[PDB]
Amino acid sequence: MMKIVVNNQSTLAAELMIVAQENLQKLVEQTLDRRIFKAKSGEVLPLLHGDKIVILLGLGLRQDFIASEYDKIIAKAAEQLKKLAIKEISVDIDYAFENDNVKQFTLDTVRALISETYVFDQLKTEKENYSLEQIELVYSGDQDIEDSAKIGSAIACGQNYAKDLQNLPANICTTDYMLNEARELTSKYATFSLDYLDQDAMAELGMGCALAVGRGSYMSNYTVCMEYKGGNEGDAPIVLVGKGLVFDNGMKMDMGGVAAVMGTMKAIAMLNLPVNVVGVMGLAENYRPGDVLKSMKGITVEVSNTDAEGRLVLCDTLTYIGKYKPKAVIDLATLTGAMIISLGDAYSGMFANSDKLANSLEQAANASNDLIWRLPLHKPYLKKIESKVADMDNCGRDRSAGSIVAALFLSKFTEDYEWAHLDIAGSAMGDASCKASGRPVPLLVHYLISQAKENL
Amino acid sequence: MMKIVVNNQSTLAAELMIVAQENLQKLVEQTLDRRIFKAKSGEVLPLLHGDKIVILLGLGLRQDFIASEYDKIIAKAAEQLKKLAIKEISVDIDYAFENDNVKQFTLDTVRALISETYVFDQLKTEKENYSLEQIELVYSGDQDIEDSAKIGSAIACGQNYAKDLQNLPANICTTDYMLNEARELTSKYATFSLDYLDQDAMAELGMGCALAVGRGSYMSNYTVCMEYKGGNEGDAPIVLVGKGLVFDNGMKMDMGGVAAVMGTMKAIAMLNLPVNVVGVMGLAENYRPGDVLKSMKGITVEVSNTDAEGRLVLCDTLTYIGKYKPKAVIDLATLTGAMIISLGDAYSGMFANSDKLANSLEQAANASNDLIWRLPLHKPYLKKIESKVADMDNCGRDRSAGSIVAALFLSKFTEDYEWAHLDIAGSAMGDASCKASGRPVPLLVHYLISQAKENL
Amino acid sequence: MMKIVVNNQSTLAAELMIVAQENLQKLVEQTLDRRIFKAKSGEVLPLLHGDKIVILLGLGLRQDFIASEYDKIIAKAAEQLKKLAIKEISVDIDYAFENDNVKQFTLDTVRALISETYVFDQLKTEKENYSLEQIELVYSGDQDIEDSAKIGSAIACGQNYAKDLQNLPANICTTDYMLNEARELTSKYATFSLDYLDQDAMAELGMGCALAVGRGSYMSNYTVCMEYKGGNEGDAPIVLVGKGLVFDNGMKMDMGGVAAVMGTMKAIAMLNLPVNVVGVMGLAENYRPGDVLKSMKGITVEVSNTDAEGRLVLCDTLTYIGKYKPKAVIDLATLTGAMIISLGDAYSGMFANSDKLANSLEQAANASNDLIWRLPLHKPYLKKIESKVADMDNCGRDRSAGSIVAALFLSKFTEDYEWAHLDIAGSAMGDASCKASGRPVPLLVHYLISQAKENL
Ligand SMILES: [Cl-]
Ligand SMILES: [Cl-]
Ligand SMILES: [Cl-]
Ligand SMILES: [Cl-]
Ligand SMILES: [Cl-]
Ligand SMILES: [Cl-]
Ligand SMILES: [Cl-]
Ligand SMILES: [Cl-]
Ligand SMILES: [Cl-]
Ligand SMILES: [Cl-]
Ligand SMILES: [Cl-]
Ligand SMILES: [Cl-]
Ligand SMILES: [Cl-]
Ligand SMILES: [Cl-]
Ligand SMILES: [Cl-]
Ligand SMILES: [K+]
Ligand SMILES: [K+]
Ligand SMILES: [K+]
Ligand SMILES: [K+]
Ligand SMILES: [K+]
Ligand SMILES: [K+]
Ligand SMILES: [K+]
Ligand SMILES: [K+]
Ligand SMILES: [K+]
């Protein structure tokens, strides 16, 4: 596997010097060796002069530094690593910002490095044969950063797993494929258990909304539950709900919901978090316009928009998970294109029926720099999905407050939970980058770690 | 004019009873007179039984009550008022919610009544000949509500004026027409003064962005400044900047920016606020794709989107107002259609480069229930308007984070102010209601009143 | 200015080693210094180890090498040059392909280097302040390459000038601006003379097609002629005709036609070619659908497509240039979007009414690797522009054989010349690269040089 260690000097054959612009001069003294690299944000200079390779990466000035953009900077170094085929790297952070707290910066540096050196060649004939085998984090200060490195490593491992699942094509990534992934993941840890419903079970429960979305398909619906019993027995679990509609459209809406749940379950299992968590996945493949379905809850839904099938899967799943008597429920869905227009790729939009939960997610977002922006769950917009023939419509007649309307639809099914909804259409896919990001795995693991600490 | 008085009993020939559902029974005792009206939110029952007419209007239960929707409820009564031709009305609020603070509820009731009985028949041959001549607010409690009524009245007067200006057609509402409105408004109050630039003056200042938007038109550009010297001489003014691009398109983007500035200037003049305020209006009428302009600031702007001309007018105006050395600058623009998708009609989206200012606007929004939602001014999205041939583009190449991008463009021109930008495309026009609302006049007057009090 | 010299060893402080993969080993012996760079096509490795910087640039294997793509490879080195701020560079070509003839490779290397280090910051506030000041071409063989370097230099100077003109925005690049460029260029060389027609002159000649295209605009039409009298007096000139419709649309059709004429006139003036050449520019700015115009030739043209105005300018200009009694006439026009669909960015599509001329252009294209593909001037497609009300239509009723139809339209005006038409919509702009290329300046200068040699 990947070796992550921490040390107070650099001992590998290649080194990556991460340099704040205000520390450039000091670095120069310790070393126009002087003039050539100015340590500007994202600037990269590989010095192959010594027998050992040295790559300088600039951060610019503290006052211009947006932490949420740090992956984009590390990306620059990661290209050089791949290009020079460097598999073992010492990462010296002594010349970064004095102000920044080292623990989070360590966590982030390790995470971004492992994340940005990710490669997908599963379906290619020519293999890249490149990956990092070792990172030696080099730090001279007095702070304990060992664990931070371990966590950033685990998270990056989960983001990359999420990326794998988002990158698979729909004909390979079938509902059976996903069900098998859940089996293979749960088999690897004694703390895991797997429960799931097939169509028959789902039909006995009256899950009319979710079953209708797959009605026409050859791929079976499944509601898959990975119970991670990290915490004390009987303590209420945190439930993560992911939407995994194969071949979903809004432009294409990928597996990001379930991909991030998988990625998050893997990470917390690796870190062995002392918290109870259930990862739940609603699986289906893509029932005419105007049909009326009966949800498990018993609310009748007129499906006015055939494009909006993803929410139908999420509503029955959200009703079903109530059995867990969850302390919190967070769902993740590449749910609306409106989200990209509202916030772009940088933020996951979030909606919550609980200020306490919203706050915790906001703290996790600040800590991890996996950015969220809360949007208002504005009840009067419920009128936009009144229906002539049914209890409610699934979608408004126009595009206005689209994401809000979608969250409101779901909110009819979650009134008994403390609940948050992350619309990750932008944050998971990009907005024209079109690249799997593995988000919001980092946010969720920070949130879960914070909840796990509150346990002790 | 309109008579607003306050009294502890009802003495006019028609009465409007505003009834919380929890107080229905109590109202019945004081009076199937019983069974017929249930005081549901917005329910209306006119009793023409007595010689005096009595209209009952329900509020539903406290726990279901969204204050920001109160105009929609009052609207129901206002239809009855017009239909029954009632010009003098006693408004009894003793049966409304006990919990609600009476002062704000009084202010809101008076405002909504005057606002919702608004009529526009200026260009019609058949006149409605309807308006409220007198409201007697009836309240039995110990709170002093006289002033609250006066304020709600002034605000509604400003909203209606704003509605008039939004409702005028572009061929009547010329830049000259607007300039004359500013003259007529400033002539009515000793506290007002008028300064303005014509094209020649604007060209001497190098206002290349704003001048370019009107370059082709017969209607002249103007930058119109209404200085309201309510406060102590030499105290830094609050500057309100409005975008008034005649015949603007994004669907059509109306005069809402300048209309709300006008409405706000009228209201604070009527209330005689002890605060220094300058209302500024950038006027122009609708220069090919790809042109490069030099702003007054000297930044060069490639105009990639011919639709996005409104921001060009706002940037030069924002630079120009710096002369005032304003304590705060708030601009208002029906700027993007993206806003309607993000938030719909209920919220003005806001962006701020100052947390202090954002907070004050958030307090005003809470107080008045003229809702705002802060969106993030996310600097990395500046990349979306990098330009090959110029300092910057005016618009991104796609629709993503559109409103944010527009705010970021403007933010390049306001780095020296505490500054907020209200995108009122949704809140001023509706999202398919398509009706002038006079917003955000109510928000701005609350904000200004709060600032005026902090003066003493 | 730029210093270009030739030498048999490298004497500047930075060096660029251009390395064929089959010569990598040999280079290594002369020098894992070994393992790291594999000389793959476009691979770049800057060695800042010595006091002098050394950049290695790979070509891959001879059998995989497409010469027309060489600029894309040089581009890789040019980024490093700019990034390391290297202004003086020795370019060693001894390790390139043995098979390639050195003269053309020298010409191409110099041209691509100067072309790919081009910067446009005319309208920017922040200047790049970067350009090559000196290239020392290093070659150990027995071939005389001095002149080749001079020519490649002149051509790159013309391509960059063309790029400048394509990159200017329409509001800066007015018909007056272009007329002034022709004045400034003709003033710099005794061999140049300037004749031109304004609108009045054009109207006396009956140029009804060209005048109609600008009829509505403020920018005047001009037909601008730069007579370059390099050759013997009285010898028939080669006429290059360029279409320069400001703000033209098809997506946007730029100044590429006149830009390349300008660039070509500059280059041959610098090289002092002993050939008679007239560069002619039809200038206008953007007359309803269905109008009938009388061309100078007297053919009546129904303008069915308002988008197709560019050809109307070209037809009157083509008639007019007959006065020169030209030996050959080549026109260049970003004329159809169809071209990009047919051939993409790599080829200029060409049409000719003369096999002799087509052949010469094909030889120039082979020599310079400024690629052309001849398309058929298929007379039966003349039926697609038959007109009910006029001699002919300007455009077909559908998109089929669009470029061919456009060439056929023009061919009605050139039956007395040996004539070629280059549709450079793809080759000048890119197809989503969207980048000015300065093509086909290189092709035209090779053609002209070849014609100049045939003179002696
Ligand atoms: Cl990994
Ligand atoms: Cl959906
Ligand atoms: Cl939507
Ligand atoms: Cl609850
Ligand atoms: Cl923990
Ligand atoms: Cl009024
Ligand atoms: Cl705009
Ligand atoms: Cl937009
Ligand atoms: Cl400030
Ligand atoms: Cl006050
Ligand atoms: Cl040059
Ligand atoms: Cl054309
Ligand atoms: Cl075509
Ligand atoms: Cl001939
Ligand atoms: Cl020659
Ligand atoms: K297990
Ligand atoms: K199925
Ligand atoms: K949308
Ligand atoms: K006055
Ligand atoms: K004008
Ligand atoms: K939009
Ligand atoms: K001359
Ligand atoms: K003209
Ligand atoms: K086409």
DSSP-based three-state secondary structure for C85: coil
Residue A431 CA to ligand 21 center (angstroms) comes to 14
- Number of Cβ within 10 Å of residue B122's Cβ equals 10
DSSP-based three-state secondary structure for B344: coil
CA distances from B176 to A163, B182, B215, B249, B336 (A): 59, 10, 16, 20, 25
Q: Which ligand is nearest to the CA of A274?
A: 5
Length of chain C counted residue by residue? 456
A66–chain C Cβ distance below 8 A for any pair: no
Q: What residues in B contact A347, CB-CB < 8 Å?
A: 376, 378
C36–chain A Cβ distance below 8 A for any pair: yes
Let me know: does A58 contact C58? Beta carbons within 8 Å: no
Strand ranges (DSSP E) for C189-321?
192-197, 222-229, 238-246, 248-249, 252-253, 276-285, 291-294, 300-303
Let me know: does B448 contact B238? Beta carbons within 8 Å: yes
The sign of the CA dihedral A151, A157, A162, A163 is: positive
Could you say which of C122, C125, C170 has the minimum Cβ distance to residue B299? C125
Q: Which CATH superfamily is domain A154-453 in?
A: Zn peptidases (3.40.630.10)
| Residue A303, φ and ψ in degrees, nearest 5 | -90, 95
Burial class (CB in 10 A: 0-12, 13-18, 19+), C128: exposed
Burial class (CB in 10 A: 0-12, 13-18, 19+), C409: buried
Could you say which of A48, A84, A85 has the minimum Cβ distance to residue C49? A48
C311 in catalytic set? yes
Which residue, A45, A63, A62, is CA-closest to A54? A45
**Given B34, B35, B62, B311, the catalytic residue:** B311
Could you say which of B341, B380, B400 has the minimum Cβ distance to residue A66? B380
Residue C440: is the preceding peptide bond cis (ω within 30°)? yes
Residue B379 CA to ligand 8 center (angstroms) comes to 17
Q: Known binder of ligand: residue A243?
A: yes
Q: Which ligand is nearest to the CA of B186?
A: 19
Structural domain boundaries in chain A: 3-139, 154-453
Residue of C nearest to A86 (CA): C36
The b/e string for B305-322 (b: 16+ C-beta within 10 A; e otherwise) is eeebbbbbbbbbbbbbbb
| CATH entry, C3-139, from 3.40.220.10, 3.60.15.10, 3.40.309.10, 2.60.120.260 | 3.40.220.10
Let me know: does C153 contact C4? Beta carbons within 8 Å: yes
A41 vs A237: CA distance, rounded Å: 42
A197 vs A206: CA distance, rounded Å: 12
Let me know: does C437 contact C165? Beta carbons within 8 Å: no
Q: What residues in A contact B379, CB-CB < 8 Å?
A: 66
For A347, residues 6+ apart whose C-beta sits below 8 A from its C-beta are A371, A372, A373, A426, A427, B376, B378
A400 vs B431: CA distance, rounded Å: 7
C177–chain B Cβ distance below 8 A for any pair: no
Count helices and strands (H / E) in chain A. 14, 19
For C134, residues 6+ apart whose C-beta sits below 8 A from its C-beta are C2, C3, C4, C5, C12, C87, C88, C89
Residue of C nearest to A82 (CA): C36
A419 vs A454: CA distance, rounded Å: 19
Let me know: does C281 contact C224? Beta carbons within 8 Å: yes
Let me know: does A403 contact A414? Beta carbons within 8 Å: no
| Residue C184, φ and ψ in degrees, nearest 5 | -70, -35
- Number of Cβ within 10 Å of residue A214's Cβ equals 24
- Taking CB atoms within 8 Å and a gap of at least 24, the contacts of A194-199 are A194/A224, A194/A225, A194/A226, A194/A227, A195/A225, A195/A227, A196/A222, A196/A223, A196/A224, A196/A225, A197/A222, A197/A223, A197/A320, A198/A222
